[PDB]
Short mmCIF file of all heavy atoms in Angstrom, two decimals:
data_model
loop_
_atom_site.label_atom_id
_atom_site.label_comp_id
_atom_site.label_asym_id
_atom_site.label_seq_id
_atom_site.Cartn_x
_atom_site.Cartn_y
_atom_site.Cartn_z
N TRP C 88 81.43 88.02 89.57
CA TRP C 88 81.40 89.35 90.17
C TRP C 88 80.42 89.35 91.33
O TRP C 88 79.46 88.57 91.34
CB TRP C 88 81.02 90.42 89.14
CG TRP C 88 79.58 90.42 88.75
CD1 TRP C 88 79.00 89.72 87.74
CD2 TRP C 88 78.53 91.21 89.34
NE1 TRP C 88 77.65 89.99 87.68
CE2 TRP C 88 77.34 90.91 88.65
CE3 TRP C 88 78.49 92.12 90.40
CZ2 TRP C 88 76.13 91.49 88.98
CZ3 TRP C 88 77.28 92.70 90.72
CH2 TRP C 88 76.11 92.38 90.01
N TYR C 89 80.66 90.22 92.30
CA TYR C 89 79.89 90.24 93.54
C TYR C 89 79.26 91.61 93.76
O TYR C 89 79.68 92.62 93.19
CB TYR C 89 80.76 89.88 94.75
CG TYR C 89 81.91 90.84 95.02
CD1 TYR C 89 81.70 92.06 95.65
CD2 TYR C 89 83.21 90.51 94.66
CE1 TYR C 89 82.74 92.93 95.89
CE2 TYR C 89 84.26 91.37 94.91
CZ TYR C 89 84.02 92.58 95.53
OH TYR C 89 85.06 93.44 95.78
N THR C 90 78.24 91.62 94.61
CA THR C 90 77.63 92.86 95.06
C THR C 90 76.98 92.62 96.42
O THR C 90 76.71 91.48 96.81
CB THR C 90 76.59 93.39 94.06
OG1 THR C 90 76.11 94.66 94.50
CG2 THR C 90 75.43 92.43 93.95
N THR C 91 76.73 93.71 97.14
CA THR C 91 76.09 93.66 98.45
C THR C 91 74.66 94.17 98.31
O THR C 91 74.44 95.31 97.88
CB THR C 91 76.86 94.49 99.47
OG1 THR C 91 77.16 95.78 98.92
CG2 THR C 91 78.16 93.80 99.85
N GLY C 92 73.71 93.33 98.68
CA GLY C 92 72.31 93.70 98.59
C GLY C 92 71.44 92.56 99.09
O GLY C 92 71.92 91.46 99.38
N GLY C 93 70.15 92.85 99.18
CA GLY C 93 69.19 91.89 99.68
C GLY C 93 68.57 91.07 98.57
O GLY C 93 69.24 90.25 97.92
N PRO C 94 67.27 91.26 98.33
CA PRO C 94 66.61 90.51 97.27
C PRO C 94 67.17 90.89 95.91
O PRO C 94 67.66 92.02 95.72
CB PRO C 94 65.13 90.93 97.41
CG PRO C 94 65.18 92.25 98.10
CD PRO C 94 66.36 92.18 99.03
N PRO C 95 67.13 89.98 94.94
CA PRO C 95 67.64 90.31 93.60
C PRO C 95 66.90 91.48 92.98
O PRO C 95 65.70 91.66 93.19
CB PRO C 95 67.42 89.01 92.81
CG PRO C 95 67.37 87.94 93.85
CD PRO C 95 66.73 88.57 95.05
N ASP C 96 67.63 92.28 92.21
CA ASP C 96 67.15 93.52 91.64
C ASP C 96 67.43 93.54 90.15
O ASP C 96 68.42 92.96 89.69
CB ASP C 96 67.84 94.71 92.33
CG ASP C 96 67.08 96.02 92.17
OD1 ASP C 96 66.92 96.49 91.03
OD2 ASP C 96 66.64 96.57 93.20
N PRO C 97 66.56 94.18 89.35
CA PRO C 97 66.86 94.33 87.92
C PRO C 97 68.17 95.04 87.64
O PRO C 97 68.77 94.82 86.58
CB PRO C 97 65.66 95.12 87.40
CG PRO C 97 64.54 94.77 88.31
CD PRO C 97 65.14 94.44 89.66
N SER C 98 68.63 95.91 88.55
CA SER C 98 69.94 96.51 88.38
C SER C 98 71.03 95.45 88.39
O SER C 98 71.98 95.51 87.60
CB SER C 98 70.19 97.54 89.48
OG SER C 98 71.23 98.43 89.12
N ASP C 99 70.90 94.45 89.27
CA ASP C 99 71.87 93.36 89.30
C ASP C 99 71.85 92.57 87.99
O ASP C 99 72.91 92.18 87.49
CB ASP C 99 71.58 92.43 90.48
CG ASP C 99 71.32 93.20 91.77
OD1 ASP C 99 71.96 94.25 91.97
OD2 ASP C 99 70.49 92.74 92.57
N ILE C 100 70.66 92.32 87.43
CA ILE C 100 70.59 91.58 86.18
C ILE C 100 71.20 92.40 85.04
O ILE C 100 71.88 91.85 84.17
CB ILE C 100 69.13 91.16 85.89
CG1 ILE C 100 69.10 89.81 85.17
CG2 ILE C 100 68.38 92.18 85.05
CD1 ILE C 100 67.70 89.35 84.84
N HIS C 101 70.99 93.72 85.05
CA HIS C 101 71.60 94.56 84.02
C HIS C 101 73.12 94.53 84.13
O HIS C 101 73.82 94.40 83.12
CB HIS C 101 71.05 95.99 84.16
CG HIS C 101 71.86 97.04 83.45
ND1 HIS C 101 72.64 96.75 82.35
CD2 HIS C 101 72.07 98.35 83.72
CE1 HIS C 101 73.26 97.84 81.95
NE2 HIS C 101 72.93 98.83 82.77
N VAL C 102 73.64 94.62 85.36
CA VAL C 102 75.08 94.58 85.56
C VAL C 102 75.64 93.23 85.12
O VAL C 102 76.72 93.16 84.51
CB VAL C 102 75.43 94.90 87.02
CG1 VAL C 102 76.90 94.61 87.29
CG2 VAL C 102 75.11 96.35 87.34
N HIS C 103 74.94 92.14 85.43
CA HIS C 103 75.41 90.82 85.02
C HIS C 103 75.42 90.68 83.51
O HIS C 103 76.36 90.12 82.93
CB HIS C 103 74.55 89.73 85.66
CG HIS C 103 75.21 88.38 85.69
ND1 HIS C 103 75.74 87.78 84.57
CD2 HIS C 103 75.44 87.53 86.72
CE1 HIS C 103 76.26 86.62 84.90
NE2 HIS C 103 76.10 86.44 86.20
N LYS C 104 74.38 91.17 82.84
CA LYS C 104 74.35 91.10 81.38
C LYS C 104 75.49 91.91 80.77
O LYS C 104 76.11 91.49 79.79
CB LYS C 104 73.00 91.58 80.84
CG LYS C 104 71.81 90.76 81.30
CD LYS C 104 72.16 89.28 81.42
CE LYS C 104 70.98 88.47 81.93
NZ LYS C 104 70.97 87.09 81.37
N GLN C 105 75.79 93.08 81.35
CA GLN C 105 76.92 93.87 80.85
C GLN C 105 78.24 93.15 81.10
O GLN C 105 79.11 93.12 80.22
CB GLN C 105 76.91 95.25 81.49
CG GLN C 105 78.29 95.87 81.65
CD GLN C 105 78.23 97.33 82.03
OE1 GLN C 105 77.22 97.81 82.54
NE2 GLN C 105 79.32 98.05 81.78
N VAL C 106 78.41 92.56 82.29
CA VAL C 106 79.64 91.87 82.63
C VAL C 106 79.84 90.62 81.79
O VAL C 106 80.98 90.19 81.56
CB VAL C 106 79.64 91.55 84.15
CG1 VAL C 106 80.46 90.31 84.48
CG2 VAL C 106 80.14 92.75 84.94
N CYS C 107 78.75 90.04 81.27
CA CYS C 107 78.84 88.81 80.49
C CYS C 107 79.73 88.96 79.26
O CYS C 107 80.21 87.96 78.72
CB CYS C 107 77.45 88.36 80.06
SG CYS C 107 76.62 87.24 81.21
N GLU C 108 79.97 90.20 78.80
CA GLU C 108 80.85 90.42 77.66
C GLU C 108 82.30 90.06 77.94
O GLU C 108 83.09 89.96 76.99
CB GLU C 108 80.76 91.89 77.22
CG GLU C 108 79.41 92.29 76.65
CD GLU C 108 79.21 93.79 76.66
OE1 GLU C 108 80.14 94.52 77.07
OE2 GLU C 108 78.12 94.25 76.25
N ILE C 109 82.68 89.87 79.20
CA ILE C 109 84.07 89.61 79.55
C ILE C 109 84.37 88.12 79.60
O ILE C 109 85.33 87.65 78.99
CB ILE C 109 84.41 90.29 80.90
CG1 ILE C 109 84.46 91.81 80.72
CG2 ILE C 109 85.72 89.76 81.45
CD1 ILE C 109 84.66 92.57 82.01
N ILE C 110 83.54 87.34 80.31
CA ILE C 110 83.75 85.91 80.45
C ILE C 110 82.49 85.18 80.00
O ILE C 110 81.39 85.74 79.99
CB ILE C 110 84.13 85.51 81.90
CG1 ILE C 110 84.94 84.21 81.90
CG2 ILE C 110 82.90 85.38 82.76
CD1 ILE C 110 86.16 84.24 81.01
N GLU C 111 82.67 83.91 79.62
CA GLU C 111 81.57 83.14 79.05
C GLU C 111 80.50 82.83 80.09
O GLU C 111 79.31 83.00 79.83
CB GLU C 111 82.10 81.86 78.42
CG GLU C 111 81.03 80.83 78.08
CD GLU C 111 80.96 79.71 79.10
OE1 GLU C 111 82.02 79.31 79.62
OE2 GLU C 111 79.84 79.23 79.38
N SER C 112 80.91 82.37 81.27
CA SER C 112 79.98 81.92 82.31
C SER C 112 80.29 82.64 83.61
O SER C 112 80.95 82.09 84.51
CB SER C 112 80.07 80.40 82.49
OG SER C 112 81.41 79.95 82.42
N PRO C 113 79.83 83.88 83.76
CA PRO C 113 80.08 84.62 85.00
C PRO C 113 79.20 84.13 86.14
O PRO C 113 78.03 83.77 85.95
CB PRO C 113 79.75 86.07 84.63
CG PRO C 113 79.34 86.06 83.17
CD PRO C 113 79.01 84.65 82.82
N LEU C 114 79.77 84.13 87.33
CA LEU C 114 79.04 83.80 88.54
C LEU C 114 78.34 85.05 89.08
O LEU C 114 78.36 86.11 88.45
CB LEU C 114 79.97 83.18 89.58
CG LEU C 114 79.82 81.68 89.82
CD1 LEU C 114 80.42 80.90 88.66
CD2 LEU C 114 80.47 81.28 91.13
N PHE C 115 77.72 84.93 90.25
CA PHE C 115 77.06 86.08 90.87
C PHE C 115 77.03 85.82 92.38
O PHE C 115 76.15 85.10 92.87
CB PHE C 115 75.66 86.27 90.31
CG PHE C 115 75.00 87.54 90.74
CD1 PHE C 115 75.70 88.52 91.41
CD2 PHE C 115 73.66 87.76 90.48
CE1 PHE C 115 75.09 89.69 91.80
CE2 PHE C 115 73.04 88.92 90.87
CZ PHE C 115 73.76 89.89 91.53
N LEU C 116 77.97 86.41 93.10
CA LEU C 116 78.06 86.26 94.55
C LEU C 116 77.32 87.41 95.21
O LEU C 116 77.64 88.58 94.96
CB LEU C 116 79.52 86.21 95.00
CG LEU C 116 79.78 85.72 96.42
CD1 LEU C 116 81.04 84.89 96.45
CD2 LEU C 116 79.89 86.89 97.39
N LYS C 117 76.35 87.09 96.05
CA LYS C 117 75.54 88.09 96.74
C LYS C 117 75.83 88.01 98.24
O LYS C 117 75.74 86.94 98.84
CB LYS C 117 74.06 87.87 96.47
CG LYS C 117 73.15 88.93 97.06
CD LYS C 117 73.35 90.27 96.36
CE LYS C 117 72.61 90.31 95.04
NZ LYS C 117 72.12 91.68 94.73
N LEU C 118 76.16 89.16 98.83
CA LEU C 118 76.42 89.26 100.26
C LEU C 118 75.35 90.12 100.91
O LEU C 118 74.89 91.11 100.33
CB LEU C 118 77.81 89.85 100.53
CG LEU C 118 78.30 89.80 101.97
CD1 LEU C 118 79.66 89.15 102.06
CD2 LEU C 118 78.34 91.20 102.57
N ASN C 119 74.96 89.74 102.13
CA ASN C 119 73.93 90.46 102.87
C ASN C 119 74.54 91.11 104.10
O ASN C 119 74.70 90.45 105.14
CB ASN C 119 72.79 89.51 103.28
CG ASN C 119 71.42 90.07 102.96
OD1 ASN C 119 71.17 90.52 101.84
ND2 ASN C 119 70.53 90.04 103.94
N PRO C 120 74.91 92.40 104.04
CA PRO C 120 75.48 93.05 105.22
C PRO C 120 74.44 93.56 106.20
O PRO C 120 74.78 93.80 107.37
CB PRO C 120 76.30 94.21 104.63
CG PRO C 120 76.03 94.20 103.14
CD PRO C 120 74.87 93.30 102.88
N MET C 121 73.19 93.72 105.77
CA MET C 121 72.11 94.22 106.61
C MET C 121 71.04 93.15 106.81
O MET C 121 69.84 93.42 106.73
CB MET C 121 71.50 95.49 106.03
CG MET C 121 72.18 96.77 106.48
SD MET C 121 72.26 96.91 108.28
CE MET C 121 73.17 98.45 108.46
N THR C 122 71.48 91.91 107.05
CA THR C 122 70.54 90.81 107.23
C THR C 122 69.72 90.99 108.50
O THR C 122 70.16 91.63 109.47
CB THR C 122 71.29 89.48 107.27
OG1 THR C 122 70.36 88.40 107.09
CG2 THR C 122 72.03 89.30 108.59
N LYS C 123 68.51 90.44 108.49
CA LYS C 123 67.59 90.54 109.61
C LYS C 123 67.14 89.17 110.11
O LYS C 123 66.08 89.05 110.73
CB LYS C 123 66.38 91.39 109.24
CG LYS C 123 66.66 92.88 109.18
CD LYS C 123 65.92 93.54 108.02
CE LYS C 123 65.83 95.04 108.21
NZ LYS C 123 67.11 95.73 107.90
N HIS C 124 67.93 88.12 109.84
CA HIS C 124 67.59 86.77 110.27
C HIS C 124 68.88 85.97 110.41
O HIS C 124 69.97 86.46 110.12
CB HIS C 124 66.62 86.11 109.28
CG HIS C 124 66.94 86.39 107.85
ND1 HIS C 124 68.16 86.10 107.28
CD2 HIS C 124 66.18 86.92 106.86
CE1 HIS C 124 68.15 86.45 106.01
NE2 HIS C 124 66.96 86.95 105.72
N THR C 125 68.74 84.73 110.87
CA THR C 125 69.86 83.83 111.04
C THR C 125 70.16 83.02 109.78
O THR C 125 71.07 82.18 109.80
CB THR C 125 69.61 82.88 112.21
OG1 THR C 125 68.38 82.17 112.00
CG2 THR C 125 69.53 83.66 113.52
N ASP C 126 69.42 83.25 108.70
CA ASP C 126 69.69 82.58 107.44
C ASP C 126 71.05 83.02 106.89
O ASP C 126 71.56 84.10 107.21
CB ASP C 126 68.57 82.89 106.43
CG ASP C 126 68.95 82.55 105.01
OD1 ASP C 126 69.07 81.35 104.69
OD2 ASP C 126 69.12 83.49 104.20
N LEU C 127 71.64 82.15 106.08
CA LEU C 127 72.97 82.41 105.53
C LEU C 127 72.96 83.71 104.73
O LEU C 127 72.20 83.83 103.76
CB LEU C 127 73.40 81.25 104.64
CG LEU C 127 74.84 80.76 104.76
CD1 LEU C 127 75.27 80.71 106.22
CD2 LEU C 127 74.99 79.40 104.11
N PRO C 128 73.77 84.71 105.10
CA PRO C 128 73.75 85.98 104.37
C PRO C 128 74.46 85.93 103.03
O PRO C 128 74.16 86.75 102.16
CB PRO C 128 74.46 86.95 105.32
CG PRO C 128 75.39 86.07 106.10
CD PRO C 128 74.72 84.73 106.23
N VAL C 129 75.38 84.99 102.84
CA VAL C 129 76.12 84.85 101.59
C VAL C 129 75.44 83.77 100.75
O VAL C 129 75.20 82.66 101.23
CB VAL C 129 77.59 84.50 101.85
CG1 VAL C 129 78.23 83.91 100.61
CG2 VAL C 129 78.35 85.74 102.32
N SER C 130 75.14 84.11 99.50
CA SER C 130 74.51 83.18 98.57
C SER C 130 75.18 83.28 97.22
O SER C 130 75.37 84.37 96.68
CB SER C 130 73.01 83.46 98.44
OG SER C 130 72.77 84.63 97.68
N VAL C 131 75.55 82.13 96.66
CA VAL C 131 76.18 82.05 95.35
C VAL C 131 75.10 81.78 94.32
O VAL C 131 74.36 80.79 94.43
CB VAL C 131 77.28 80.98 95.31
CG1 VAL C 131 77.60 80.60 93.87
CG2 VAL C 131 78.53 81.48 96.01
N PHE C 132 75.00 82.65 93.33
CA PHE C 132 74.02 82.55 92.27
C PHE C 132 74.73 82.31 90.95
O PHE C 132 75.83 82.83 90.71
CB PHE C 132 73.19 83.84 92.18
CG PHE C 132 72.00 83.86 93.10
CD1 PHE C 132 72.04 83.21 94.31
CD2 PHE C 132 70.86 84.56 92.76
CE1 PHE C 132 70.95 83.24 95.17
CE2 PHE C 132 69.77 84.60 93.60
CZ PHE C 132 69.82 83.93 94.81
N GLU C 133 74.12 81.50 90.08
CA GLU C 133 74.68 81.23 88.77
C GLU C 133 73.70 81.68 87.70
O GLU C 133 72.52 81.32 87.73
CB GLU C 133 75.00 79.74 88.59
CG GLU C 133 75.81 79.43 87.34
CD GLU C 133 74.97 78.80 86.25
OE1 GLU C 133 73.76 78.61 86.46
OE2 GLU C 133 75.53 78.48 85.18
N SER C 134 74.19 82.47 86.74
CA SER C 134 73.37 83.00 85.67
C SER C 134 73.76 82.31 84.37
O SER C 134 74.70 82.73 83.70
CB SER C 134 73.53 84.52 85.55
OG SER C 134 72.43 85.09 84.87
N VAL C 135 73.03 81.25 84.02
CA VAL C 135 73.19 80.56 82.75
C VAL C 135 72.11 81.07 81.81
O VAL C 135 70.95 81.26 82.22
CB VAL C 135 73.14 79.03 82.92
CG1 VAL C 135 71.72 78.53 83.16
CG2 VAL C 135 73.75 78.35 81.70
N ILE C 136 72.49 81.35 80.56
CA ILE C 136 71.55 81.92 79.61
C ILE C 136 70.59 80.83 79.15
O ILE C 136 70.97 79.93 78.39
CB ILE C 136 72.29 82.55 78.42
CG1 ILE C 136 73.57 83.25 78.90
CG2 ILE C 136 71.39 83.53 77.68
CD1 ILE C 136 73.31 84.50 79.72
N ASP C 137 69.34 80.92 79.60
CA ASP C 137 68.33 79.96 79.20
C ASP C 137 67.94 80.17 77.74
O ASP C 137 68.35 81.14 77.09
CB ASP C 137 67.11 80.05 80.11
CG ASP C 137 67.30 79.34 81.43
OD1 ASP C 137 67.22 78.09 81.45
OD2 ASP C 137 67.53 80.02 82.45
N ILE C 138 67.14 79.25 77.22
CA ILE C 138 66.75 79.26 75.82
C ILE C 138 65.31 79.72 75.68
O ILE C 138 64.62 79.35 74.72
CB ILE C 138 66.96 77.88 75.17
CG1 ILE C 138 66.50 76.77 76.13
CG2 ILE C 138 68.42 77.68 74.79
CD1 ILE C 138 66.36 75.42 75.47
N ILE C 139 64.84 80.51 76.64
CA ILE C 139 63.48 81.04 76.60
C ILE C 139 63.42 82.15 75.56
O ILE C 139 64.19 83.11 75.61
CB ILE C 139 63.04 81.54 77.98
CG1 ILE C 139 63.05 80.40 79.00
CG2 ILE C 139 61.65 82.17 77.90
CD1 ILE C 139 62.24 79.20 78.58
N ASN C 140 62.49 82.02 74.61
CA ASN C 140 62.36 83.00 73.54
C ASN C 140 61.60 84.23 74.03
O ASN C 140 61.11 84.28 75.17
CB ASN C 140 61.66 82.38 72.33
CG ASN C 140 60.51 81.46 72.72
OD1 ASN C 140 60.73 80.35 73.21
ND2 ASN C 140 59.29 81.92 72.50
N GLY C 141 61.51 85.22 73.16
CA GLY C 141 60.81 86.45 73.52
C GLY C 141 61.60 87.22 74.55
O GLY C 141 62.82 87.43 74.41
N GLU C 142 60.92 87.67 75.60
CA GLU C 142 61.59 88.37 76.68
C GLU C 142 62.54 87.43 77.41
O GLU C 142 62.26 86.24 77.57
CB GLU C 142 60.56 88.95 77.66
CG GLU C 142 61.12 90.00 78.60
CD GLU C 142 61.41 89.45 79.99
OE1 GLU C 142 60.61 88.62 80.47
OE2 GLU C 142 62.43 89.85 80.59
N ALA C 143 63.68 87.97 77.83
CA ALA C 143 64.72 87.18 78.50
C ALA C 143 64.32 86.97 79.95
O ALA C 143 64.78 87.68 80.85
CB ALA C 143 66.07 87.87 78.38
N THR C 144 63.46 85.99 80.19
CA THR C 144 63.09 85.62 81.55
C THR C 144 64.28 84.96 82.23
O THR C 144 64.58 83.79 81.97
CB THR C 144 61.87 84.69 81.55
OG1 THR C 144 62.17 83.50 80.81
CG2 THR C 144 60.67 85.38 80.91
#
Side-chain angles (χ1 to χ4, degrees):
Chain C
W88 74 270
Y89 62 79
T90 185
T91 48
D96 200 297
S98 199
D99 314 325
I100 213 181
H101 163 27
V102 170
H103 200 307
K104 299 324 178 148
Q105 150 169 21
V106 152
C107 270
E108 293 161 2
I109 289 174
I110 206 54
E111 167 258 324
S112 40
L114 252 75
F115 189 10
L116 194 142
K117 185 68 79 148
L118 189 127
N119 228 50
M121 271 306 177
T122 195
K123 286 141 161 77
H124 41 56
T125 56
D126 164 69
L127 223 42
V129 161
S130 74
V131 162
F132 274 31
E133 190 255 1
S134 201
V135 75
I136 322 290
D137 280 283
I138 41 167
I139 299 306
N140 40 287
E142 196 259 322
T144 60

